[model samples]
Target: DFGDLVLLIGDLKIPYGAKELPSNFRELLATDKINYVLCTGNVCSQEYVEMLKNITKNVYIVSGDLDSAIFNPDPESNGVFPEYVVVQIGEFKIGLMHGNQVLPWDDPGSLEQWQRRLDCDILVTGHTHKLRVFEKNGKLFLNPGTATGAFSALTPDAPPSFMLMALQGNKVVLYVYDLRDGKTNVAMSEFSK
Candidate 1:
């Protein structure tokens, strides 16, 4: 049997905002076993969100620094409280946010601050355009990087990628998919008493 659920990241724009959707993206979408889609922002349009909704039953979207204003609105545009969303999967309480608290760069301290305030077992964010997975203050912090290899101020050379997390019982296994080379590298981390 598979884990309790699957977590997907953001910045998935068709053809980096130009051509057709990425080839690998279709492969990912065809996998019907995925349980949830946790978008960390940069979806850019309502159409994109709607397409995502078609694929997964549970989808959590946090407005990013560059999300479309028409769908998110000004008050909900920023990546902070109120704009953030909480999702409960199995026994895990997961928090989702795009995490642009301090613009033009990524600050782990700021992200940690928000994670503490939100007080969730797992915290996910994007906007750094780099893949990262680590634990802090007893919480799992994840940045799935750029699924489309979009450019960012931080890590201009970072490849396009996303993460797939499996939560089974109280254990979580994370697999980072680097779109640059078309491979899924597995990484594991657990949370338990």
Candidate 2:
């Protein structure tokens, strides 16, 4: 059965990369079943934050290299968003970050270190504009890709993607969604803490 749903989206470099999320993905979210929104960064605008709020009030975001400076003003001047965030869902401690700080970007070893440092059951991040999910050291790592199909140094032609995580007790069901050749597709996987 479904549980507390958390939306995972990232790299929406609007006005610089793609303009909007895929139509099919938009339609799927109309169910209004989502309970929380966890964005991985590059959300570059207030409009998009409002869009997420409409999906659910529990919206959490991190700083991306391209995030608007005003929205999340940081003296660091890299991006307004804090470098990372942590949230509690069911029996899990979920972490969020933009992944820009992970050297050699998207490296499994680097990500694993961050996961360990954060001490969370699930760690979600995005910067590669590529979708990825895996279990390492009994911890879950997720990169939701680019919701707007934004171009990145690595995946200039990456597909648009996002994730929905259903949290129930000690279990979580991850629903991965993506668009290929203009058609939407979904994949599911289950994990427990």
Candidate 3:
């Protein structure tokens, strides 16, 4: 049952500035059986949020370093964290964030602190603009990178990508789509608590 669910992550809004969906993006959306949409911020407008809402059943968002709005005006909007959330899909606790707390970018130390406070079985973040997923202290930390394919000032070579995380029982399978290379890089990790 849970094996059938797909998780979608949307990243940086820099390249999109004020535009419609990128060509390949629509095709990606159409291909997946996306059950949930979790965002890692930089979705610069209410219009963008509304657009995403039309595509999935459940949407969870976290404010990025660049999101200027203090509060998302939509009634359905989930406020920017320090927001700690736990969703039970099969036997896993899914945690999400658009981490900006770490300075100098991609610091695992800052994520470690937040992981302790949030106490999630699986943790997700987007800031470094590079895809990463690994386990520490029995918790999984995932960074889906920049799905928009925007160049990062921090790491110019960081690939533009997004992730699809499928959870079944205690195992989580991560699939990263590299826009530049036109290939999917995959990794799998598990958690138990």
Q: Number of clashing residue pairs in every model?
A: 0, 1, 0
lDDT per residue for candidate 3 within 26-95, as digits (tens), equals: 6776655777777777765667766666767676777776777445545655544334355565666666
| Candidates sorted on TM-score, descending | 2, 1, 3
User: How do all models score by TM-score?
Assistant: 0.81, 0.91, 0.79
Q: What shift in Å separates residue 148 of candidate 2 from its native position after superposition? A: 0.8
Instruction: Return the lDDT, model 2, position 67.
Output: 73
Candidate 1 structure lDDT: 0.70
Q: Which ten residues in a row have the lowest lDDT in candidate 2?
A: 70-79
Q: Could you give candidate 1's per-residue lDDT for residues 4-32 as a string of tens digits?
A: 65656776544344243357666765687
Kindly list the per-residue Cα lDDT of model 2 for residues 60-113, writing each as its tens digit. Answer: 888788875427433454434668999987788889999989988989899999
Comparing candidate 2 with candidate 3, which one achieves the higher TM-score?
A: 2
TM-score of the candidate numbered 3?
0.79
User: Where does candidate 2 clash, by residue pair?
Assistant: 72-80
Stretches of candidate 1 off by over 4 Å are 13-21, 69-82, 102-105, 181-193
